[PDB]
């Protein structure tokens, strides 16, 4: 398992998401 | 205006929220 920061881990748990930096990157990814 | 924390203000500016 890869190493993930605490905020990333909490978001992945509560939202329900490790695959993935800017504001426009989120818009393109989504 | 109402006081808004730094993360809240940055998100509103960089995502178009009031």
């Amino acid at each position, epitope marked *: *398992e890869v*190493a*993930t*920061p*605490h*905020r990333a*881990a*909490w*978001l992945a*748990m*509560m939202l*329900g998401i490790a695959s993935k930096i800017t504001v426009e990157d989120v818009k393109r990814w989504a | 205006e109402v006081a*808004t*924390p*730094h*993360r*809240a203000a940055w998100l509103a500016m960089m995502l178009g929220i009031d």
Partner: antibody
Amino acid sequence: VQLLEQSGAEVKRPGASVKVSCKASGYTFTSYAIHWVRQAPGQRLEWMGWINPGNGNAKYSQRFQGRVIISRDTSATTSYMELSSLTSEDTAVYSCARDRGFDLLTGHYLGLDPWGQGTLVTVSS
Amino acid sequence: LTLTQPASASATPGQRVTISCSGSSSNIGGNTVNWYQHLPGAAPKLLIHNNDLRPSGVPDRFSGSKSGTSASLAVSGLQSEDEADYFCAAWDDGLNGWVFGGGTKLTVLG
């Protein structure tokens, strides 16, 4: 009041399994993740695993994968931790803690709160 | 990677005592440090979250400081109620889970 009530002490023979409960009250059970940790006598706390009661997804530490199962009961607002293949090294106080998470506006982390009173599990032949 | 914390600390009532917490780039350097009071035979009580913030019921006496991989809990004006165990806690990226300090047993010499 925010309360985590936790089951009474257990005595188990080596090789058996134990199932510790954690009943939650005072808050929305499905909106906050539950953590399970243990503390052996004369030892630091050792994080075991954690679960999202909203969707049931659970993750575990590497040292405990294949031996621990963390589950939840939404109707009873209860989280369960079951530890298998007990040995003398598994004697410890087992605790559940609520993860208050991150505040979206401030980005602040709100800490693990509250804590269960603990359950002493003694593994002795 | 784990959190290093002094085994014990002590002082007379009314004095100031500081409890250290040592970590690495993967736990304290990148993530926040949280402090807990563990009373004898009681559930741990949150004292400091996000490295310096106190909950509603925690008095001004308890304060936290952070510098890189090191953190500290300062207790000013010691009281008999302050005699307990204090441990730091932080997320570790390598473990993908929480790590805890060994705990510092604080005794107020009353």
